[PDB]
Design a protein around this ligand. Structure first.
Ligand SMILES: N#Cc1ccc(Cn2cnc3ccccc32)cc1
Ligand SMILES: [Cl-]
Ligand SMILES: [Zn+2]
Ligand SMILES: [Zn+2]
Length: 574
């Protein structure tokens, strides 16, 4: 315990030797409080202006305006699972890893790969000012090289999480990425490799994936969201995930084993408390890993939980209190005989999941799931799961998927969500100190995503043409903080569409290109109203009629540049 974390604690305590104190009134129970030192400091979402000027009817929708404005979950403990549960998880984790690594090879990620990642402004939780300064400098990689040697010796000095999301100093992110980055970077959780997974599939393929699941014989499709899944990660899960190292070798295996046992399984965290003071607390369980590593581990553990719930549903094991030597061989024979087929009945994306089990016994297979700590959100603990009989209403990654027939007979499966949600997100700009040019480039990014993924929604196709028309044609799309983002490009969007939906799409057998935007269909007007369209309102009819005047107001605010008129792509203006 304190033989592992004590080293990190001493360093921070010594830096603030003139401000150290063990306060009497500390609110931590589940967290172990080690001490505190004095601090004083705090990101409030800002309005992307180009987007708001071109979506005026939504200035009065409070679903949209409210999004732009504006604890006791992390301070919770999970009961140690039963012995029978722990054995099932241990046996399944072991069999899963072996499957994931049949056609993979664990490997250390490089300083070159991590370097190019910070240059492209990748999303990472963090002497030097910017994230790019320490990478260019060499004295950093000495700080990294120091820790790296201490990790090989089985000790840790500077790998302390920051709670503001679990941030960490860039050096720790590198060492984390070096050992475990291979899971993301070499697509371990691809659908080709993992069967349940969807990493790097993109909003335009998920829909086709749910449908392919649907085509299998079985019961309802079950989409149960776990209540605060990161805070429901047990130490037994952290141990089951660490069994990946058993597929590694040499310097890699020891560097991985280190991260797991020194950072994940023994955490140290600095937390600001307004009463301002920085409290140094520790804990062994819960999730705080790298946002990208977390995804792959959450997908791993979630696959494991869902495979076990299917075994409970199919009556492979009777009771979780203790596992018999006949219940072991049966569970093991199950994984070997059908475990692959049962993975292909799922779509898992981190804490998210959609399962089409063999029958509806699954719905009331809640003993193992509740014991693993994977407690379902907003349903009684022992009340059975409400199934879905139609794949076009099943929720997945914040979306639902409409089947949609093109005028030449070919079948698009398009993603969709409440249009008040899409317009509200586009109107937000994360960060301060943005130029009119930068804000405008982010707007083009959303409009190009809308034209590619949400083209079938009338108000988005129109507002997309308007935004692209109000932004100089060459000005490149920019991202605030980084699956597949093909809308990030200056190429002609009808050409992107043809590549994405016709050329590259393996569910389309006829590869005849689409020649104009009119050949690309919309959802029914009621479907479009059901998913939140304003078609039929006077405001939207006025907005659409007088659309050029808004484009010209933005054109006037930016200045005299090279602008294109994209509105003639729609029939009404044509
Ligand atoms: N269900 C339904 C419904 C039927 C008609 C309208 C009127 N409306 C206004 N703008 C439109 C654009 C394209 C199509 C219709 C449009 C609204 C909703
Ligand atoms: Cl219709
Ligand atoms: Zn360390
Ligand atoms: Zn919809």
């Amino acid at each position: 315990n304190l033989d592992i974390i004590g080293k990190r604690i001493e360093k921070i305590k010594q830096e603030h030797e003139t401000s150290w104190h063990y306060d009497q009134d500390h609110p931590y129970k589940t967290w172990a409080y080690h001490g505190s030192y004095e601090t004083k400091q705090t990101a409030s979402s800002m309005v992307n202006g180009v987007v708001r000027l071109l979506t005026k009817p939504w200035d009065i929708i409070p679903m949209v305006t409210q999004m732009a404005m504006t604890k006791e979950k992390v301070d919770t403990r999970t009961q140690e699972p039963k012995e029978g549960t722990k054995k099932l998880m241990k046996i399944t984790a072991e069999w899963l890893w072996k499957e994931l690594g049949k056609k993979k090879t664990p490997r250390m990620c490089t300083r070159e790969e991590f370097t190019r990642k910070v240059r492209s402004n990748a999303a990472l939780g963090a002497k030097w000012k910017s994230a790019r300064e320490a990478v260019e400098d060499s004295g950093f990689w000495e700080l990294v090289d120091k820790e790296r040697n201490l990790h090989l010796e089985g000790k840790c000095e500077t790998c302390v999480y920051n709670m503001m999301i679990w941030y960490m100093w860039l050096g720790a992110r590198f060492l984390e990425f070096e050992a475990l980055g291979f899971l993301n970077e070499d697509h371990w959780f691809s659908r080709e490799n993992s069967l349940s997974g969807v990493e790097g599939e993109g909003l335009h393929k998920l829909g086709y994936i749910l449908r392919d699941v649907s085509k299998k014989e079985g019961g309802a499709m079950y989409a149960d969201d776990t209540a605060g899944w990161d805070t429901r990660i047990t130490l037994e899960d952290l141990k089951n995930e660490e069994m990946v190292t058993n597929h590694m070798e040499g310097e890699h295996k020891k560097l991985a084993e280190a991260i797991f046992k020194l950072t994940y399984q023994n955490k140290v965290v600095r937390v600001q408390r307004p009463t301002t003071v920085m409290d140094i607390i520790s804990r062994r369980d819960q999730r705080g890993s790298g946002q990208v590593v977390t995804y792959g581990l959450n997908t791993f553990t979630n696959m494991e939980a869902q495979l076990i719930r299917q075994m409970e549903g199919e009556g492979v094991f009777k009771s979780i209190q203790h596992l018999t030597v006949t219940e072991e061989i049966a569970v093991k024979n199950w994984l070997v005989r059908v475990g692959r087929e049962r993975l292909s009945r799922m779509a898992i994306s981190g804490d998210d999941c959609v399962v089409k089990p063999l029958d509806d016994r699954f719905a009331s297979a809640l003993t193992a799931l509740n014991d693993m700590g994977k407690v379902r959100k907003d349903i009684q603990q022992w009340e059975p799961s409400r199934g879905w009989n139609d794949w076009t209403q099943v929720p997945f990654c914040s979306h639902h998927f409409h089947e949609l027939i093109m005028k030449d007979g070919r079948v698009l499966v398009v993603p969709c969500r409440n249009q008040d949600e899409l317009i509200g997100r586009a109107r937000i700009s994360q960060g301060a100190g943005w130029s009119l040019r930068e804000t405008a480039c982010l707007g083009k990014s959303y409009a190009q995503m809308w034209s590619l993924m949400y083209f079938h929604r009338r108000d988005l196709r129109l507002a997309a043409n308007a935004i692209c028309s109000a932004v100089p044609s060459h000005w490149v799309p920019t991202s605030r903080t980084t699956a597949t983002h093909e809308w990030m490009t200056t190429e002609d969007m009808l050409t992107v569409w043809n590549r994405v939906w016709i050329q590259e799409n393996p569910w389309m057998e006829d590869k005849t290109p689409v020649e104009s935007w009119e050949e690309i269909p919309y959802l029914g007007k009621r479907e479009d109203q059901w998913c939140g369209s304003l078609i039929g309102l006077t405001s939207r009819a006025t907005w659409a009629k007088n659309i050029q005047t808004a484009i010209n107001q933005v054109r006037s605010l930016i200045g005299n540049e090279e602008y294109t008129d994209y509105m003639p792509s729609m029939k009404r203006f044509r």
